[PDB]
Ligand binder design. Structure first.
Ligand SMILES: Cc1cc2nc3c(=O)[nH]c(=O)nc-3n(C[C@H](O)[C@H](O)[C@H](O)COP(=O)(O)OP(=O)(O)OC[C@H]3O[C@@H](n4cnc5c(N)ncnc54)[C@H](O)[C@@H]3O)c2cc1C
Length: 295
């Protein structure tokens, strides 16, 4: 079933940008864009939780052509308009410090993508990944632990679960389990897809819980800035009791670094019932119910 590598770097699909929209509001930190591509012309199909490659134009500092960068698909299999004609991405412009030898450094593929014009042609590969896939069971529980652009696989899950047009298009997937997003960003303007996320929770208060960790607006109990791991610690017992369900899947996605705090919190919960989390977790991985994509 799972489509993989319908296009490869040696002969990528040439898509066209339909749209490029700002996801970070005024007063937020950084630039994250929602970019939709036209898939007509070829046969790139994909499902939720997968990634695609984008090959940027240009050569590196060595004169060699730039390679593909991997990006979590931010749309469901059907695309944002539920026509099966497009695919979307959620791209943060990488930028950073003086210790890089220059000044402020801007990432090649991410600057290219966040500044790209509708009408522009992009080299696209994939889809890739069997690690962040959603169970076909409509009564599965789905815990989603996301920071920043790690919201992208979560968006594909939630849109498939809860969008009116998605439910109408997917007769076999009528989600009636429980899902819980814990989403961590620096500010409220940085809550990507905030409006749609909150409308899902208003529409399905019993099937979807939304929790934010906003570091510039909230403090954890020890006085530090609030991060996703603090929220997982706060709800460690609850999250552990859902994780004990044979049908619960947990997904972690975002830049690398949150996993160590998530594990310490869940470890302390499981220890209360004589269970060593790290061992339970290894069994969850083998079972295909512990999903991780950090980068
Ligand atoms: C499976 C997967 C999925 C991904 N999904 C997404 C996504 O949905 N959205 C998204 O925005 N990104 C995503 N990324 C990351 C994305 O692929 C690119 O790595 C990222 O966009 C930066 O690429 P670039 O071309 O902009 O940067 P480059 O020009 O390749 O710059 C990156 C390099 O500069 C260095 N560097 C980076 N940050 C720092 C820092 N703080 N300090 C010092 N040196 C640094 C490192 O050498 C790094 O290799 C994903 C990565 C993977 C592996």
């Amino acid at each position: 079933d799972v489509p993989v590598n319908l296009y490869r770097p040696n002969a990528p699909f040439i898509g066209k940008v339909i749209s490029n929209e700002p996801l970070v509001k005024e007063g937020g930190i950084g630039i994250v864009q929602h970019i939709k591509f036209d898939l007509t012309g070829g046969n790139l199909k994909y499902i939720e939780g997968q990634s695609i490659g984008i090959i940027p134009p240009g050569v590196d500092k060595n004169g060699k052509p730039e390679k593909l960068r991997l990006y979590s698909i931010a749309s469901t299999r059907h695309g944002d308009d539920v026509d099966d004609k497009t695919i979307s991405l959620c791209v943060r412009q990488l930028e950073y410090k003086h210790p890089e030898s220059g000044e402020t450094v801007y990432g090649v593929c991410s600057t290219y993508l966040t500044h790209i014009e509708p009408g522009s042609e992009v080299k696209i590969t994939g889809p890739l990944g069997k690690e962040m896939l959603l169970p076909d069971d409509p009564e599965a529980n789905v815990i989603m632990l996301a920071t920043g652009t790690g919201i992208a696989p979560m968006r594909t899950y939630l849109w498939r679960m809860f969008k009116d047009a998605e439910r109408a298009a997917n007769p076999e997937y009528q989600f009636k389990g429980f899902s819980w997003l814990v989403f961590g960003v620096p500010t409220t303007p940085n809550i990507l897809y905030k409006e749609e996320l909150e409308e899902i929770q208003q529409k399905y208060p019993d099937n979807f819980r939304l929790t934010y960790a906003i570091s510039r607006e909230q403090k954890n109990p020890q006085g530090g800035r609030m991060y996703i791991q603090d929220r997982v610690a706060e709800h460690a017992d609850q999250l552990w009791q859902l994780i004990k369900n044979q049908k619960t899947h947990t997904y972690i996605c975002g830049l690398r670094g949150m996993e160590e705090g998530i594990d310490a919190a869940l470890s302390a919960a499981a220890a209360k019932e004589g269970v060593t989390w790290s061992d339970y977790q290894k069994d969850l991985k083998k079972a295909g119910r512990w999903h991780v994509e950090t980068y």
